Amino acid sequence: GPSNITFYFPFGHVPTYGGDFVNLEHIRALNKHGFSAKVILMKNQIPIVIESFPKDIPVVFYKPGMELNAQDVFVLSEGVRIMYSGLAQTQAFRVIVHNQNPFYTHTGMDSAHDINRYRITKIITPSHYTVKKLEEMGITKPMAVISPYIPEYFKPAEKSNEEIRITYSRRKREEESKILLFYLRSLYRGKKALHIRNLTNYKREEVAEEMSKAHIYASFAERESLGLMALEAMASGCHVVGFSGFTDFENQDVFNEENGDWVKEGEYKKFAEKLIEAIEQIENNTPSPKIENGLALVNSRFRQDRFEQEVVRVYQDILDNLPPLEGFNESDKVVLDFWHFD
Template sequence: MGRILYYCEQGRITGGIKVSYRHVDTLRRNGFDAAIVHKHVERPDWFAAPDVPILSADEVVLSPRDVVVIGEDSRFTLRGVANTPARKVLLCQNHYYVAFGLHGARDFSGFGIEAALSTGDVVTAFLRRRFPGLPVATAHLAIDPALYRPRPKQLRIAAIPRKRPHEMEYIRDLLRAEHPEHAGVRWAILKDAAEGLVARVMGESAVFLSLARLEGIGLTGLEAMASGCAVTGFLGDGGREYASAENGWWADGEDLDSAVRQLAACLTAVRGGTAETRIAAGRATAARYTLEREERELVAFWRNFLT
């Protein structure tokens, strides 16, 4: 068995990088020779990156025994390794980015992709629809309960505006104007924050406003659920995998006015002491996304692929 090499971009704070590192760490614990490949051999410092090997993309020499793992939007990597002797696997964490990786190609066959590994049910359904001949497996994402957990709560709305900065300001303004009873509630805006800070703020905040947009799954919503937040806002499409009327106050599609109404209803429930049932349902939902399930599904995929 050769190496399993996860090619991973640097310089951005994204959940996809965390997942790649966790996959490599999990595979190594299960006896696989796995490593991260970066342009520069530098370990990210914005999350607790496991101590796994990091190789320089400029120095890696690929052999037929190696397997290259490539993100769905990494069009330069897809083309750069297409003619190498290594086998290739697509790691798709967001189906909305697939077109960027293809960059006009009909499918991934011209890049030597033999199989795809997805991180969620919505992504898997898309891949099977778009590429009916491509073998697809799912290794569902996981929430670390030691990191994302409830802490002593304060009446505060936590939000990560990266995908919807304009929408967040619209929602904040209209909430103040149309629901003055909630105008004094404080906000915790998390911009390019390290994972430890995100987890602490979520754990201490009573409410989390999901500003998800075009997501494969919308992991922050699940992390907020695990942190004991009352969760409201957008599904970002991928959140359809886990969201329901029982575990959150969800906006209708892309409707901003609906998001304002749902946020107001969520705050009213939290302040009135009637939100606990949905908060508990949210924690139960997040509890399904275990590290053990992710490991079991990931290892099963690689054992099957390599036999």
């Protein structure tokens, strides 16, 4: 029969980081396809925060003393340590971890050993690379992959045949972007001025607008799981040049020599050189084939329809393999009073 299970995704703030938005996308796909998924808003139950969740995202407020069903599932971030310690206070529920930031695993958990000994049913990740990284850290829990998607509003528009536009972000490696720009100013001896635009405090729709009009995206990616902004750029028809976000580049099989002009750590000269090459490919009308390769990568592997199919497959596979509750029956009510937030 039906599972009678709801998946709860904890929040404590306005959705802000990429990971937050991906979680809302899991919720939407789950509810669209016959599951039940909700935000549990742990704290900061105030207008700006409440109103920040679109109306199609069900929200339940945490209040000490509220009840859930013993069979319900919490889908925890790798961050927020207090959710793990809180849920240790009961043998009810199940726990899934959606680890979207493998290098920030330390914020939630002290070691691989603590993860391995916790009652985690499955770790969902954004990429095959993430699975390998968590395994390298010594985590032995079962893992799954659901790759985020790039919204359809990321797509090429008209790019100026007169003015070449380079976009970048200072979200990561801000100091290194200054080093790079010094090398670029120093090595570039072409006659049209460089037009550089910073996409740092923009909303995602506005990022898409800017990328759609830009020729080149200079990548300052760092310790990525997948590399959303480089995929966004590719989806927008930008030539991506710079850091891949993967020191151990061989451990990911998304980015390759044919879809970007990637450099290794500290290769500022080569980065600047490849930017100049990318400008000249435009000026001399000798386009990089990497643009089309990138477009095809995103359109094949990172759009919404496939994402929804993977959400359904992965979460259904979890439901199908839960063991019976121990020490509870189905739809026993369990009091949640494990947190008291300032």
